[PDB]
RNA sequence: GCCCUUCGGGGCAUUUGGUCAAUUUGAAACGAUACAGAGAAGAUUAGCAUGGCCCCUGCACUAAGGAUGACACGCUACUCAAAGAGACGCUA
């Protein structure tokens, strides 16, 4: 449960936990700093970006242990999906042909553009022009497309 | 990056965003202060309307209030002459 219980109605996490955990801290005190990040000096939208990217990268790291290094169980890999240390949509995505490297979900969003558009994040490099560092202004990426 | 392959080649995925963060120079509103002081032909006053490039409060743009909310109190030649005498004089 997300739903924090006191101290006698916590359930232990599967085992295996212990060995990650030091990593998930890691990533949750990033995140917690990323709440702290000044806005003073940087556009609006900017101020959201390392949230999408510490949470991309924590499901990076549970994705990867467990469908490339397979150093975590099955079980430990389903409470860490349900109890919110990994994103499972974008997981979901990452396992599809064409969107292994997808930022974040609402870079897909077709509906919610104006022209019904994906980001230009999601373009390959060589259709775009040199010198340009484009910079998503959902999550600050500069080029989520597989061949990329 | 991955997948398919008759290793010739092919496939999956496809253009976000009305936002400079940056307050003197792209537009807020008063109050205090000074000043003036609430309509109906003596004095004192309850009101209800009327007209709209005057509004305020209100959900009320089918209430009720805001001094009867305020405002009106001004300014004023022009559809415009005819007579029958007399007369400085004109004139037949
Ligand atoms: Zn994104
Ligand atoms: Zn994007
Ligand atoms: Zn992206």
């Avoid at 232990?12 to 700093?33: T, W």
């Avoid at 997981?91 to 994906?118: M, P, V």
Wanted: overall charge positive.
């Amino acid at each position: 449960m997300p739903a924090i219980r006191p101290a006698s109605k916590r359930k232990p996490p599967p085992d295996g936990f212990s060995d990650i955990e030091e990593d998930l801290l890691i990533f949750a005190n990033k995140m917690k700093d990323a709440q702290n990040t000044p806005t003073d000096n940087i556009p609006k939208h900017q101020a959201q970006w390392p949230i999408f990217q510490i949470a991309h990268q924590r499901s990076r790291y549970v994705y990867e242990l467990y469908y490339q290094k397979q150093a975590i169980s099955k079980q430990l890999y389903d409470w860490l999906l349900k109890n919110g240390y990994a994103d499972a949509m974008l997981i979901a995505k990452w396992k599809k042909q064409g969107y292994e490297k997808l930022c974040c979900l609402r870079c897909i969003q077709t509906k919610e553009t104006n022209f019904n558009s994906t980001c230009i994040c999601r373009v390959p490099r060589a259709q775009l022009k040199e010198d340009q560092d484009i910079q998503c202004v959902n999550c600050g990426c500069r080029g989520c497309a597989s061949t990329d």
